[PDB]
From a paper:
ECF transporters consist of two identical or highly similar cytoplasmic ATPases, EcfA and EcfA′, and two transmembrane subunits, EcfT and the S-component. The membrane-embedded S-component serves as both the substrate-binding and the substrate-translocation domain. The other three subunits (EcfA, EcfA′ and EcfT) together form the ECF module that energizes substrate transport by the S-component.
We determined crystal structures of the ECF–FolT2 complex from L. delbrueckii in the apo state (no nucleotides or folate) and in an AMP–PNP-bound state at 3.0 and 3.3 Å resolution, respectively. Two patches of well-defined electron density were observed in EcfA and EcfA′ of the complex crystallized in the presence of Mg–AMP–PNP and were assigned to the nucleotide molecules. The AMP–PNP molecules interact only with motifs from a single ATPase subunit, and are separated from the signature motifs (LSGGQ) on the other subunit. Therefore the ATP hydrolysis sites are still incomplete. Even though AMP–PNP molecules are bound to both subunits, binding does not lead to the closed conformation of the ATPases. In the AMP–PNP structure it is packed tightly against the FolT subunit and interacts with the loops L3 and the C terminus of H5, but in the apo structure it has hinged away and the two membrane proteins interact less tightly. Our structural work shows that the binding of AMP–PNP to ECF–FolT2 is not sufficient to form the closed EcfA–EcfA′ dimer.
Residue numbers in the entry:
A (entry chain A): 1 to 280
B (entry chain D): 6 to 264
C (entry chain B): 2 to 282
D (entry chain C): 8 to 175
Write the structure that this text describes.
């Protein structure tokens, strides 16, 4: 069914300080086995969501508050058991890295769970193998590109076999080639193990390929659901603090000079074949 | 920017906690004794080990170079210990003697043999191994009042973030220089007060990684030190006997000649 | 008046393991035009950045910039005045800042170049508005700010003394799209204001849409120096020396391959809109 | 609990890494070098207190020892002295205000008590008197440097590092 929901609840940091830091009532949910992006301006509260789901942070009602992830209500105890169904890949690998080799870092969580080493070895090999990091497996963090550092981050969480992979702006500053691969990595990873990928990104061109997106602004969500219906929000969406993708701006910049607009229509090959049709 | 390790390609340099413990044992073997022949047996053994490695001698100079002044300063000044000593004439008190200047060759060999085994350790092995070497020296004292989980953990984190703090230091250096920061230059005050723009942004960057690392740690399931397993796992293999040979063979005869 | 005369660079010289940042760079750049710098990662593009403010000096050849000339010999004597002309805001400028307030931190730059207190006070606000944030927080401490504002005041502190040549590595690398087309606007507005702009970013969307010069780099070597057209047009070329087409050039090439050939030179989206009316024409 | 915890502890790991790096470099002028490792020592004092301080210096010598020389070793006891410096910085500075009486009395003692006595006691490994004279030979620095150190420490500590402690 549905994998994760956040019911009526609110949150603050650091602890309750002055003016009103928070997300909002929220009233938000996501389906099992579906890639879902979460977008908002800088300081819209996108990080908190990931740490809330994670359990590192707690909401400020606790009566009204229900965050349940695959059948656990979060809430003080049970937090390590909800922490085993979710995993998080933070942006900027350097600070998120721990351990000597890469084969050292990706078995960290594994020894957190007191897994015997003879098994630990096998898993960790397959883990780095899965992320393509195979023969860099004795190298230390400093030698690695921040891109392939974030491959080691993946193999880190891929090792403990989570049902939800959160990407928190993991792709942020990488190569174009390097940002291409990491998503195509986790996107490969997804189909294999049948997981849920919660992406967080400022890149709107890769939000178009989400199953469901949802927008968050200043405290709260405004619109949510299938990318098809969310991106057409045009003008308001611009003032909202984020922007248009390329295909949709292509739609826009076509119409600005008058040209036809059949819409949604959100793809590449579906455009390209539609392009043959419009040429007629 | 690594140091030192011309450890490339030759034989040994194996089993660090064996090797480390040896150099710790050799230190205290020198410390012990004595007037004659004891100083002979440890000095020859120390020399045996350094070319057993097959190491270029030139590297040993690197460690003694700052101390050279300190050697010959204390050595000859030990001789001229105002009487003091000892056996011969030539001449005063207050002056050289055949006994006085032998003692001054002993401080030379001890200071050498300290900075030989100290060198032979700090070069032939690798830092992450040495960290697991002196984790072993800590192993016994656990059930005394010290939690070894924590003083093992902070070392591990420290080491890893030493270079990545160094590079973010020079990034701040150059980032400030580009903005017109000039240092050192100046004199006394402001030479000085010009150091803070490289410090506090280095300090606050430490918090950013402190939070991020602790955050990313807990989320991967870090409950505490108690109740884990380990990935790394050093092993003794067959060469192990060679440092125990050095250890037990030298120092039974060194102890008999001690007195 | 940027000129690089057979300029290489080698790391760790007189030492074993000398890695080469730059190999025989020869090129010259227009005064007051948007000059993009791109390559794969570990190209040596950030090395090149701190070359012409002379944080590093060439190990070969000559660099004539800002009416100075930078030899392998040139010392650390007069570089002070070289840097009021040329300026760098490194990849993360948020980590560049300090003291008790925003205002005194930006003026720190001009103050170091010998601006009067009055001059530095007015020059402070002059560029703290230009970076569009904000009336009230101008007197706030720099440390409580958001990542949007933290990488502003830094970029103000670099711009406050009005560098003639400005080179910024990945200044928008962490921002949101409201930020980019905000920050990328000021770079272009400073440009037509009569100042040179070097900008180094992987982003090929704003490299085509903004930049005039692009000079690619690979393994320390200069592979191409041109308009973002000459270099961008050859498709499989960009594969060979690892680079990538912008968003427009990617989709057009595909619709073209099976489809119609428009007259572009696609670059920015407005021109793309031009190119697809001619399709029916 | 024991005292501190993760995120308190990951910080302790990042501020030792400072003082192994700091103690590597010296500034310094044509007149005198006055190497700066000491800022690392004082930080561990007033933040993490006296008793974690002692645990900081002891480890900071073990940390440097792997990536650098120790100029000898191991000793053990060099580490013992590297330890005691940050500790008595902990006193006068932890759960304590910013005051001119606390800083200078602390700087002068570090040189004389631990730096002198212990450095006067470690290359000892022999009889004591040959030792004192090698250090008696070296004293000038311990006369000059502590005084520039008190000026320097006031410019770091009250000098916006402690004022920027919070927040955060
Ligand atoms: N102590 C704190 N811990 C965490 N967040 C804090 C704290 N204090 C304030 N905040 C706010 O938390 C918000 C989280 O927003 P955030 O998700 O960081 O947006 P962002 O700029 O895109 N950075 P991020 O998404 O994490 O990569 C920010 O607006 C901060 O102002
Ligand atoms: N301190 C150093 N010593 C030796 N080689 C270095 C050093 N710093 C960098 N290099 C080398 O020089 C090149 C650095 O290129 P550089 O442009 O700085 O990185 P980049 O990722 O391509 N650009 P950027 O992302 O803006 O930092 C690489 O080939 C490095 O191996």
């Amino acid at each position: 069914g549905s994998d994760n929901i956040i019911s009526f609840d609110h949150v603050t940091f650091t602890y309750p300080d002055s003016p009103r830091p928070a997300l909002s009532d929220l009233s938000f949910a996501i389906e099992r086995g579906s890639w879902t992006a979460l977008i908002g301006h800088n300081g819209s509260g996108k990080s908190t969501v990931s740490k809330l789901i994670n359990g590192l942070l707690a909401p400020d009602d606790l009566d009204k508050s229900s965050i349940t992830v695959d059948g656990v209500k979060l809430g003080a105890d049970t937090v390590w058991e909800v922490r085993e169904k979710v995993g998080i890949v933070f942006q900027n690998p350097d600070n998120q890295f721990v351990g000597a080799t890469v084969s050292d870092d990706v078995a960290f969580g594994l020894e957190n769970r007191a897994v015997p080493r003879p098994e630990m070895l096998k898993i960790v090999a397959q883990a780095v193998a899965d992320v393509g990091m195979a023969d860099y497996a004795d190298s230390e963090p400093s030698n690695l590109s921040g891109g392939q550092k974030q491959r080691v981050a993946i193999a880190g969480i891929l090792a403990v076999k989570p049902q939800v992979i959160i990407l928190d702006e993991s792709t942020s500053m990488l190569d174009p080639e390097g940002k291409e691969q990491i998503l195509d990595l986790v996107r490969k990873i997804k189909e294999d193990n049948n997981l849920t990928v919660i992406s967080i990104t400022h890149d709107l061109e890769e939000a178009a390929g989400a199953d469901q997106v949802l927008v968050l602004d200043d405290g709260q969500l405004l619109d949510q659901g299938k990318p098809e219906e969310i991106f057409p929000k045009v003008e308001m969406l611009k003032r909202i603090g984020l922007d248009i993708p390329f295909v949709y701006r292509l739609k826009q910049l076509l119409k600005e000079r008058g040209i036809v607009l059949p819409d949604e229509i959100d793809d590449d090959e579906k455009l390209v074949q539609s392009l043959w049709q419009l040429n007629s | 920017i690594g140091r030192y390790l011309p450890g490339t390609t030759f034989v040994y340099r194996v089993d660090p906690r064996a090797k480390l413990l040896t150099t710790f044992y050799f230190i205290i073997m020198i410390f012990l004794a004595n007037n004659w022949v004891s100083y002979l047996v440890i000095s020859i053994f120390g020399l045996a080990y350094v070319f057993a490695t097959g190491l270029k001698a030139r590297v040993f100079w690197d460690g003694v170079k700052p101390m050279i002044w300190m050697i010959v300063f204390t050595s000859l000044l030990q001789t001229f210990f105002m009487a003091g000593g000892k056996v011969y004439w030539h001449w005063w008190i207050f002056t050289l003697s055949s006994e006085g200047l032998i003692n001054g060759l002993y401080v030379f060999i001890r200071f050498a043999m300290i900075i030989l085994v100290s060198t032979v350790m700090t070069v032939t092995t690798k830092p992450l191994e040495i960290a697991d070497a002196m984790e072993w020296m800590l192993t016994p004292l656990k059930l005394f009042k010290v939690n070894v989980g924590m003083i093992s953990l902070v070392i591990s984190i420290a080491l890893r973030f030493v270079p990545t703090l160094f590079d973010q230091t020079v990034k701040i250096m150059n980032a400030q220089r580009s903005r017109g920061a000039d240092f050192n230059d100046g004199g006394l005050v402001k030479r000085a007060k010009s150091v803070v723009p490289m410090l506090v942004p280095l300090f606050i960057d430490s918090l950013e990684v402190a939070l991020d690392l602790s955050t990313a740690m807990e989320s991967r399931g870090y409950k505490g030190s108690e109740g884990r397993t380990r990935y790394r796992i050093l092993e003794w293999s067959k060469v192990d006997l060679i440092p125990v040979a050095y250890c037990l063979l030298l120092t039974i005869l060194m102890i008999t000649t001690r007195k | 008046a940027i000129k690089f005369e057979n300029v290489s660079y080698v790391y760790s010289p007189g030492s074993p393991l000398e890695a080469i940042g730059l190999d025989q760079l020869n090129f010259s750049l227009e005064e007051g035009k948007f000059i993009a710098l791109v390559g794969h990662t570990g190209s040596g593009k950030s090395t090149l950045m701190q070359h012409f403010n002379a944080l590093l000096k060439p190990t070969s050849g000559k660099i004539e910039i800002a009416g100075y000339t930078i030899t392998p010999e040139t010392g650390n004597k007069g570089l002070k005045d070289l840097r009021r002309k040329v300026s760098l805001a490194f990849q993360f400028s948020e980590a560049q800042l300090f003291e008790n307030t925003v205002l005194k931190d930006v003026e720190y730059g001009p103050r170091n170049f010998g601006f009067s207190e009055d001059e530095a006070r007015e020059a402070a606000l002059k560029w703290l508005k230009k970076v569009g944030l904000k009336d009230d927080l101008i007197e706030h401490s720099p440390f409580d700010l958001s990542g949007g504002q933290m990488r502003r005041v830094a970029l103000a502190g670099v711009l406050a003394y009005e560098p003639e040549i400005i080179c910024l590595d990945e200044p928008a690398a962490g921002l949101d799209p409201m930020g980019r087309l905000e920050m990328m606007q000021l770079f272009k507005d400073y440009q037509a204001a009569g100042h040179t702009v070097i900008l180094v970013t992987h982003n090929m969307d704003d490299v085509a849409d903004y930049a005039d010069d692009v000079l690619a780099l690979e393994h320390g070597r200069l592979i191409k120096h041109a308009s973002p057209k000459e270099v961008f047009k050859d498709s499989e070329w960009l594969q060979k020396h690892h680079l990538a087409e912008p968003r427009s050039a990617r989709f057009a090439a595909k619709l073209e391959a099976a489809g119609l050939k428009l007259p572009g030179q696609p670059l920015t989206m407005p021109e793309l809109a031009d190119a697809i009316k001619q399709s029916l024409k | 609990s024991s005292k501190l915890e993760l995120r308190e502890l990951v910080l302790l790991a990042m501020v030792i890494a400072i003082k192994v790096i700091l103690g590597q470099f010296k500034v310094g002028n044509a007149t005198l070098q006055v190497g700066l490792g000491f800022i690392g020592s004082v930080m561990l004092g007033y933040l993490f207190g006296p008793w974690w301080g002692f645990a900081g210096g002891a480890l900071s010598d073990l940390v440097s020892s792997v990536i650098f020389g120790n100029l000898g070793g191991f000793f053990i006891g060099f580490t013992l002295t590297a330890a005691l410096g940050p500790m008595i910085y902990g006193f006068f500075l932890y759960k304590q205000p910013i005051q001119i009486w606390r800083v200078i009395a602390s700087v002068i003692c570090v040189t004389v008590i631990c730096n002198i006595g212990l450095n006067t006691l470690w290359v000892s490994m022999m009889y004591g008197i040959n030792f004192m004279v090698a250090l008696s030979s070296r004293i000038l620095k311990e006369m000059i440097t502590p005084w520039i150190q008190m000026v320097a420490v006031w410019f770091i500590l009250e000098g916006l590092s402690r004022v920027k402690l919070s927040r955060k």
